[PDB]
Ligand binder design. Structure first.
Ligand code: NA
Ligand code: NA
Lengths: 360, 359
């Protein structure tokens, strides 16, 4: 019952992610013959000529910021687009971030991993001062990919934690290689192997932060990976019982990432692939769950995680006014996330299992 | 409308006011007033920041206190009844707490100019120095607490920042209505910077925002020490008075401590004239003017005539409103980088002109 234009113009999400308010208003007030896709793609071009000029003049900092802006314009042109152009927007986002990454401070380093014989670029960022550092692996979702987590990265890098980002099955760069799968944990696991190998990172101090579907992937990664010292499900879920409650374009995304023909074929595939209730009892790390009450993800997920995640590990935050990922609530919840990832990973504070805003 | 002037989406968002906060302001229950809405938020922000300090989350504590200050600032910035002073005080005390928590910290230097306290806040870039510095000037309602976002851009680019409230502004308003000798207070701020060893004495520019731009032009013309100058939504005189929004005229009235509009006009037009003095400027000057500013393009005629050619970098933005706030961050990045060229880089930038002549 929600409209396509309105699923795309998620003011909260796009503004917190770093999309310019003024571009937003221009998207909203754009002429009716200009599509959402074209509008945002033209801006991506604009921002890219800007950054070229900056580099030419020796303005590297500005050029990194303008390239981030261009990549975010590409991300958001295509994120809920399903025709022949989607492919080009995805590819344009990737091109733009590749240029942005070495101009970002601190820089995003490329590590070209290969999982199950499939190339998987890993982007790593490292905070100020001599080595080593805790890391937060950040997990994308249904449309959220490595190129989009910039501002959340910046929060944890400010708090002396490195970041690592990648696109696995059904996501971003790997979508062409693999449809969405039931063993995402092996992707997160491969990455931990990179970080355990890279001498700039503390091996006992790796955690995982998953956003939306990434939320689900984080819980799965933690349930299957003893070496991870932190799990955050940020607007995630335990299983797909709740399918009928999904928005129309979310149902479209599920079908798109599954590469099936019908919604019921998608539901079937995703429900089995993304189940976690058989293994939630294995998560053995401090586990922070941020849940918006107004999410399409219903409160039975909160029931499930209380029922199944070991009581000693669960840090449960339910925001009564929160939408999906609590984007509508501003930066507060993100800060809280980053500070708690600090307490676990950099602080060494053995945090007490706790509840906020539950029960209602 | 008074509501639309207050809801300046571009201005507030770029300055760091939360979009979520702005939505609840636009959609507030009608019985809850703009003032009270924002003041209630600053309290909430302050409480969360105390919890954060208690938990060792110093970096979030600063950001939340910075949020508190701005909610206080924007509650009171166009308010004129008895609560106005309480709003101003709340902002002042909130920022005082925020300042040591900032990254990098804003350090308090306590000046007195002729019996009159003038708090100056100084922020230093990372690692060793000495460091170039940018003095930043507030406007009609912009005060030292407001410029956090512009600060961070220039501090990212290796330049110290210094902020203060001059005649008719902020903390000084109590002691001194708007005045004809703002150059005096700027030069005092320079004095301190010249004395502090962590700052480059031949590397101090001035960045004036809105009315602050008029002050920046006045100072550069009266201060041979100044190595750089930006007029950001500034002006050279007040011939254009009638063109000011209703709330701007009310602010003029207010900062002039008079009861009538014509009293306000007479006083400010005299006090704020620069045209007799603009040709005396011997430093790099950047003027950013938005075509749809209530400030007319006559200003551009004045400056091209009177600011000497070898120093003028003119930027006219044809879609820009007042201070080009409706154009997002790009003009602000352009200012921070230009200051970087003049003050950090061993760089002589040549007299260039962008967006002018008009189409
Ligand atoms: Na390592
Ligand atoms: Na000095």
């Amino acid at each position: 019952q929600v409209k396509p234009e309105d699923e795309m113009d998620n003011w909260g999400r796009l503004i917190l992610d770093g999309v310019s308010y003024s571009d937003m208003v221009g998207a909203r007030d754009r002429p009716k013959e200009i599509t959402w896709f074209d509008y945002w793609m033209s801006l991506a071009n604009e921002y890219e000529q800007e950054a070229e000029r900056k580099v030419a003049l020796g303005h590297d900092l500005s050029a990194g910021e303008l390239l981030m802006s261009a990549a975010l314009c590409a991300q958001y042109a295509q994120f809920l687009w399903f025709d022949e152009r989607r492919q080009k927007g995805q590819a344009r986002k990737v091109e733009l971030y590749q240029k942005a990454a070495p101009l970002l401070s601190p820089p995003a380093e490329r590590h070209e991993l290969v999982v199950d014989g499939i190339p998987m670029p890993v982007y790593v960022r490292i905070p100020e001062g001599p080595g080593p550092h805790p890391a937060v692996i950040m997990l994308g979702g249904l449309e959220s990919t490595k190129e989009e987590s910039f501002q959340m990265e910046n929060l944890v890098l400010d708090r002396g934690m490195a970041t690592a980002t990648f696109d696995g099955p059904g996501q971003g760069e790997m979508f062409e290689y693999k449809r969405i799968a039931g063993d995402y944990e092996k992707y997160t696991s491969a990455v931990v192997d990179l970080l355990t190998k890279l001498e700039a990172i503390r091996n006992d101090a790796i955690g995982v932060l998953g956003r939306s579907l990434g939320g689900n992937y984080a819980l799965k990664s933690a349930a299957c990976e003893p070496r991870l010292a932190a799990c955050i499900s940020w607007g995630g879920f335990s299983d797909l019982d709740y399918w009928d409650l999904e928005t129309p374009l979310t149902k479209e995304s599920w079908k798109y990432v599954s590469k099936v023909d019908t919604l019921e074929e998608a539901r079937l595939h995703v429900h089995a692939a993304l189940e976690t209730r058989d293994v939630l009892s294995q998560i053995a790390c401090p586990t922070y769950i941020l849940h918006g009450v107004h999410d399409e993800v219903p409160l039975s997920f909160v029931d499930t995680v209380l029922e199944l995640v070991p009581a000693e590990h669960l840090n449960l935050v339910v925001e009564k006014d929160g939408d999906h990922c609590c984007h509508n609530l501003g930066i507060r919840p993100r800060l809280e996330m980053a500070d708690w990832l600090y307490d676990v990973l950099v602080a060494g504070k053995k945090v007490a299992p706790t509840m906020k805003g539950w029960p209602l």
